[PDB]
Design a protein around this ligand. Structure first.
Ligand code: Q9W
Ligand code: K
Ligand code: K
Length: 545
DNA sequence: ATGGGACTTTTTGA
DNA sequence: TTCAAAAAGTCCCA
């Protein structure tokens, strides 16, 4: 329900929006939290505002109504005109109202607190400053009735597999006053994800992004599996449009290293660099000058992409794995004819250059003709989960029989030489599958088009793709998920560019030697490491780095 | 108990 | 008809 933002980050965000406010010029700033919860941000906003007013009370008294501007009147003023909060949870709003009332401890004061869905409220004026931490809800945990509303009314930032907080970015930008400043902490995934493309376009074309703080896979929220970033944007009449990017360099740090977050950002734990907002394409490549030179060099040298030369596909989606996946030593497999059985691997079975021997079998139930010839398999293996299987979407509509795989794909795509890689990994792991391995969606596969077989071999491809050069090169634009995990999905893996030059033969031969060592029983992996270093040297020579 | 490490399903819009 | 994206991941241990 309610998530607690660490106090240091709250202080940083509030100071980011208010440290340079000219209260004498405008003693009526509107500061809004659109998902205020119990007031994590708004109470700190109250404290900052109270200091700001009390420090200039006499200047305000002289410049304006001298009877209105007294210290004893600051509290009331702040609540009447400055602090605004919205949240869909009425208990949180009640608690926050009590807190703001008890900031003073007569005639009653009207607190601008709204218990509503902030994405449906008719907002009747814009705001000078917007801060907070919106709700994050993905496409699976959002109700379909609400998602229809989002797809209709928030189509500019919300399509397909987008997230709820995209819409909060939209709403915050839309209700921000000209010259206003907004600062929020959200998931970092929209910076790189395919779903966030339109949201990135919206932000880039409607506000000036002041600062991005990328915590990468650091754990900012205790016991929460999410990776966070802090965005600061404004609607000021500026002529430069340069973004300050602070990228964490050590994900293992605890956030309470210093009293303030500014000390952490200025320290050696973070790196700083500037990105020209006008040079952002539909993809935001937020890297330092050395990494940008590296990336551009590789992009310029390589004339092909994997998408050009390869056919990609996601793995089997059974819809209920426990009903179709059995250990190869399970006695129940004696009931299943071997024509129905396929080898089954998980993402952990994928190493560099080769796949572990499979230990699981998939019952490719689509080839079961009818329920009377193979009644025993259905009665004793698959039918154990009939109730769950019948609740799949395609079974409810009758497209799929209750014992069939939900997305069984095409068998001929898997029963061939191909390259496989895990969907989430700490490093590049592209393996040649020789054993017709099937897998779930945690492993992706591709094979080379016939017309590119004489230009690229599987051995050469796994050679360059597993190199240190390509590990770094892919990670430059990859989607950082959690600590030591990057997404390896076709929507970015197929964008990897490859080359073909005079080092092709030696690179291919080194890859073949590595594969031969890795498949031998009396394995000595050290020479594999030495061969990999030599191949990395060849690749760096080829790409001019 | 918590914080850190190993590992990854099927629901879902298009 | 049937593709592929999506971590307020999930689950475990010392
Ligand atoms: O980050 C968590 C905080 O954010 C608040 N909050 C969440 N969602 C909000 C929202 N609209 C979205 C509605 C989506 C559908 C829905 C969500 C939750 C329950 C029932 C239905 N509008 C304002 N505050 C919101 C929530 O109370 C916490 O205080
Ligand atoms: K006066
Ligand atoms: K994390």
């Amino acid at each position: 329900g309610i998530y607690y933002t660490p106090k240091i980050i709250v202080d940083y965000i509030v100071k980011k929006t208010l440290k340079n406010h000219d209260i004498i010029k405008n003693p009526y700033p509107r500061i809004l939290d659109i998902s205020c919860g119990c007031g994590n941000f708004l109470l700190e906003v109250y404290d900052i505002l109270y200091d700001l007013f009390e420090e200039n009370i006499y200047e305000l008294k002289k410049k304006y109504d001298e009877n209105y501007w007294t210290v004893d009147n600051i509290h009331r003023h702040i609540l009447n005109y400055c602090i605004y909060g919205a949240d869909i949870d009425e208990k949180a709003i009640s608690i926050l109202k009590d807190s703001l009332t008890n900031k003073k401890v007569e005639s009653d004061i009207k607190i601008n607190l709204f218990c509503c869905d902030s994405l449906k409220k008719k907002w009747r004026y814009k705001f000078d400053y917007i801060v907070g931490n919106p709700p994050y809800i993905g496409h699976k945990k959002l109700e379909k009735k609400y998602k229809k509303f989002l797809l209709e009314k928030y189509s500019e930032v919300y399509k397909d597999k987008a997230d709820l907080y995209f819409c909060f970015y939209k709403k915050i930008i839309d209700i921000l006053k000209q010259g206003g400043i907004g600062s929020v902490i959200t998931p970092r995934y929209f910076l790189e994800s395919l779903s966030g493309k339109d949201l990135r376009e919206y932000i880039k074309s409607n506000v000036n992004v002041q600062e991005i703080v990328d915590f990468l896979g650091a754990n900012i929220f205790k016991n929460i599996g999410v990776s966070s970033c802090i965005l600061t944007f404004d609607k000021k009449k500026t002529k430069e449009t340069y973004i300050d990017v602070f990228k964490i360099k050590n994900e293992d740090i605890c956030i309470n290293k210093f009293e303030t977050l500014e000390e952490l950002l200025k320290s050696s734990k973070f790196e700083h660099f500037n990105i020209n907002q006008r040079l952002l394409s539909d993809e935001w490549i937020l890297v330092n000058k050395d990494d940008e030179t590296f990336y551009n060099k590789i992009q310029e040298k390589c004339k092909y992409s994997l998408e050009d030369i390869a056919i990609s596909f996601q793995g089997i989606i059974t819809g209920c794995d426990k009903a179709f996946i059995l250990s190869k030593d399970d006695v129940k497999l004696n009931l299943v004819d071997d024509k129905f059985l396929k080898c089954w691997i998980k993402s952990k079975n994928i190493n560099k250059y080769i796949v572990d021997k499979s230990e699981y079998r998939l019952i490719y139930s689509n080839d079961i003709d009818n329920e009377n010839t193979n009644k025993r398999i259905l009665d004793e293996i698959i039918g154990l989960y009939k109730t769950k299987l019948e609740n799949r979407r395609e079974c409810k509509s009758g497209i799929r029989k209750w014992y069939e795989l939900q997305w069984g794909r095409e068998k001929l795509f898997f029963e061939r030489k191909k390259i496989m890689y895990p969907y989430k990994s700490n490093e590049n792991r592209f393996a040649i599958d020789y054993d017709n391995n099937f897998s779930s969606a945690d492993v992706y596969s591709f094979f080379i088009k016939e017309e590119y077989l004489d230009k690229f071999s599987y051995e050469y491809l796994v050679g360059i793709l597993n190199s240190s050069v390509y590990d770094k090169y892919f990670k430059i634009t990859a989607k950082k998920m959690s600590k030591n995990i990057y997404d390896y999905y076709p929507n970015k893996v197929m964008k990897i560019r490859i080359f073909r030059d005079n080092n092709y033969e030696e690179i291919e031969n080194l890859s073949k030697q590595i594969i031969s060592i890795l498949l031998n029983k009396s394995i000595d992996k050290g020479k594999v490491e030495k061969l990999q270093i030599k191949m990395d040297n060849l690749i760096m020579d080829s790409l001019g780095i």
